[PDB]
Structures are given as structure tokens and as C-alpha cells.
Amino acid sequence: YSIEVRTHSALHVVKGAVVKTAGSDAKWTTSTYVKGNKGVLIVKAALEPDKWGIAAIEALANEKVKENAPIKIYELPREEAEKMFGEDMYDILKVVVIEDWNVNACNKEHTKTTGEIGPIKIRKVRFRKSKGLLEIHFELL
């Protein structure tokens, strides 16, 4: 797999890892970004994490990677998708679903399973109190 195909599949894993810890406080992904082996996820959240709740994310991320879960893909019509899933899928349709972790209508090339992507390490986490946003830098090995 390409260095960025992997990277991009990580976005979904990291996202689900965020949802697990933050719960409802992960309001939505405002944006993402990919460059080489390095990625950035930006989420709208009320409060900021506490070092523990940052290691927890890198941990949940890597845990999902270590259980080599299938990155399920559905190419469904405009509707039908919405009945099967719903609001939780937005930021014909191409929907990427990591069972019980993340549902996302992404439109790019992904690895087949979480294993392929490999180890995820969180580099830096920035919070903007001004805007209510959480920025999460990471890269693969």
C-alpha cells in the first residue's frame, strides 16, 4: 500500500479512538489533512484532554490496529445509505465503516484491514479554546 493510503485509513481509526474517549463531546470532524506518513485530524470539542486521555487515544488507536479489523466499504445510492447508517456518517455514496468504531462517507482509497496501516503515534495535540477545536498530529511507522 501507498504511504498515504495507509495514513488516510488511520484517520478513521484515530477518529473512532477519539469518539470512544470523548463520547458526545466529539461533536464532528471539522477537517483533516494528509502529507506523506504524517496526518492531522481536527475535531470540534468543548474541553481539552489530560495527558492520560491522550495516551488513551494513541492506545485505542493502536489497539484497533493490532486486532486487524476489516475496513468495510459500501457503495450505496444517495439514500439507502442514510437508512442503513444516518447522520453519524457525514462531516451514490462511498461509505467506509470500521465495525463499531467509525462510520464515514469517505471517498478515497483505503487499506483492507486495520493491520495494514501499522503503528500510530500521536506527535502533538493542540487545543484552541478560542474556537472550541482539538487538533491531533500523528504519523505511522
Please report the domains of the chain, with CATH numbers, ordered by start residue: 1-71+110-141 (3.30.980.10), 72-109 (3.30.54.20)
Known binding residues for Zn(2+): 8, 12, 106, 110
Asked how this structure was determined, the answer is X-ray
Please, what's the b/e burial string for 107-136 (b: 16 or more CB within 10 A of its CB; e: otherwise)?
eeebbebbeebeebebeebeeeeeeebbbb
The set of long-range contacts for 125-132, using a CB threshold of 8 Å and a minimum separation of 24, is 125/49, 125/54, 127/48, 129/48, 132/44, 132/45, 132/46
Å resolution of this model?
Answer: 2.8
Are the beta carbons of 41 and 26 closer than 8 angstroms? no
**Binding annotation:** 8, 12, 106, 110
Contacts of 71 (CB under 8 A, 6+ apart): 9, 12, 96, 97, 98, 110, 111, 112, 113, 114
8 Å CB contact between 117 and 137: no
Q: What residues form DSSP beta bridges with 38?
A: 35, 139
Q: Residue 71: phi, psi to the nearest 5?
A: -90, 85
